Amino acid sequence: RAKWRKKRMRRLKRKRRKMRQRSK
Amino acid sequence: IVDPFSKKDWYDVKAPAMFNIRNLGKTLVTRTQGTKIASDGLKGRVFEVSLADLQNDEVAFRKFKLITEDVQGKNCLTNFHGMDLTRDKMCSMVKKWQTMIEAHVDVKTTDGYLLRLFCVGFTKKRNNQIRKTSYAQHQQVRQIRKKMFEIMTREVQTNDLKEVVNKLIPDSIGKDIEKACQSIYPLHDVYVRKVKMLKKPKFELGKLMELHG
């Protein structure tokens, strides 16, 4: 589904951000 | 274990003198045992009686609430407590392709009974009308509702409880509204759909017996 794929994307952006702030 | 209905007396229910049929029915209550007086269990019951079972031959879609106020020797004396139309009557008058004007006034009588009359009125389709809908404009509805506010208040604020019920057994308070609102927008089903009794004065045995004279 295009909405749950959008939800999986936002759950992935939130992980890439926290992984990027750890090494900031 | 013991049958509780063997300890109950059947009391008579008497309607006010406003109607011809006085004995509207019979009620039962537990005998005076200990401190539970049988009159205490009777002085708060409300009897919702149809107007057809009332005075002589009136309509059957109007109901009168009669609350028992004092018991005098195996017969309960009831007084006016309210009035309302039956469910099938109101649900049949509300048709489509027409507007309904509802009004309510909290106006007391000349003796102390604070009544809350509910009036309803539906726009009438003319005999030669080709239009399907009969809708009154907003300002026409306000003029019809203001006419109900004026007539309902005038009809009760100058009379007591005994005289306003004599105007409720026939649709007197509803017929004069239909005639007054005819110049604004003709109506066909104008009734006082409900009468709520908000506040009552102190109970007087002299006025109750006068109501059954």
Binding site: - | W97, N128, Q129, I130, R131, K132
Partner: protein, 132 residues
């Protein structure tokens, strides 16, 4: 289950449209006519064809059949349709005319005629039917 096939009905109509003068209301007479004027490879088919001819012959004597078209039958039935009353239905003693129709004739050369009788125009325009 006594419905005739298109083979029985079509062959029966062609026999009538070509040999109407030889056929009648008797099956056994038409059974021998169809046997000669038509080469039918079967006897059961002949009895079905001749039996339906007898049925259609009973219909011709009462009126025209929507399948059979005979020239000598259609011309006579149209010739015998010439019926007229002793007096026409149009030339009436008096004629009711609406006042609006009277004004139309007034614009024409036929303003005042004795045959015209103006009727009272009905008041109230209640010609439309109520909606809903």
């Amino acid at each position: 289950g006594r419905v005739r096939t298109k083979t029985v009905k079509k062959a029966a109509r062609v026999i009538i449209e070509k040999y109407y003068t030889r056929l009648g209301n008797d099956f056994h007479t038409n059974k021998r006519v169809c046997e000669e004027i038509a080469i039918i490879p079967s006897k059961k088919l002949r009895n079905k064809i001749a039996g339906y001819v007898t049925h259609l012959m009973k219909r011709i004597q009462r009126g025209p059949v929507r399948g059979i078209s005979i020239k000598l039958q259609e011309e006579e039935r149209e010739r015998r349709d010439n019926y007229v009353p002793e007096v026409s239905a149009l030339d009436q003693e008096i004629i009711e005319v609406d006042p609006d129709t009277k004004e139309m004739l007034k614009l024409l050369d036929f303003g005042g005629l004795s045959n015209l009788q103006v009727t009272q125009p009905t008041v109230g325009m209640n010609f439309k039917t109520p909606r809903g």
